[PDB]
Amino acid sequence: MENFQKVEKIGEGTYGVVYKARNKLTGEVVALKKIRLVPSTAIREISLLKELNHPNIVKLLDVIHTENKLYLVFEFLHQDLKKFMDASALTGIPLPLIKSYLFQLLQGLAFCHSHRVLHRDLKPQNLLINTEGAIKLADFGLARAFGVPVEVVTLWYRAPEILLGCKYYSTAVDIWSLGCIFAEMVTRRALFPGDSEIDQLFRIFRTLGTPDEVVWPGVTSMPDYKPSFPKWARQDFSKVVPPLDEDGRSLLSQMLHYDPNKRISAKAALAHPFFQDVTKPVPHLRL
């Protein structure tokens, strides 16, 4: 309103409405996120994210706290990965572009993780793409700052430790989510499309096997673990993500280990043999 020349809804988001807007002073187009309620503890923490700049992170340009309302101003990108995968469904996203995107996303996570910032809620809708071949992660650091959010809150990319009620997060949660997204780019079908917490957890178990103390020391002491969970056998990744090659299947394995401590780091993933032949292709992007 006061500081924007024109504002347009472009979707519901995790914390509130997201608008495409034009800054009145500069004329630039930005993404403006209204945070649905302001807690003073959240304003300082999120303001720190204004300094957290990388080519694969959506730039937080401004934090605007006026009229007892909170807005986040981000750099605008024209499409998200959810929409791009839908648009790409007949053909699939080409493998070199999948590889480019995964490599770039890992660079963004490695950067944020090195600065002790987690995402905690990665999903295709928060991965934004441009016509230049870049992909960028939006909303790093918001989940820690804002806590429990006030439409459905997709569970499909949630790591098993959070589904088992651990109220501790680590960098591994983001690697899990990215592994799920990698698999979805390859197969054209969400890996674990749960529509409740237990369905989500059981979809994971039916593919990866029910975890136990051998593969995941400590699991049976997780808050929401039940000894009565069914015991499913683990499937080979060759059945789960064909026609991904053995480098891709080996990297995905390491991103989807049950024990968060065993999951590959973003920095180590960048060195995986899967990326030996990575390139940066131009996407077929219809805006």
Ligand SMILES: O=c1cc(Br)cc[nH]1
């Ligand atoms: O977390 C796991 C479980 C098995 Br079995 C193999 C690899 N990773």
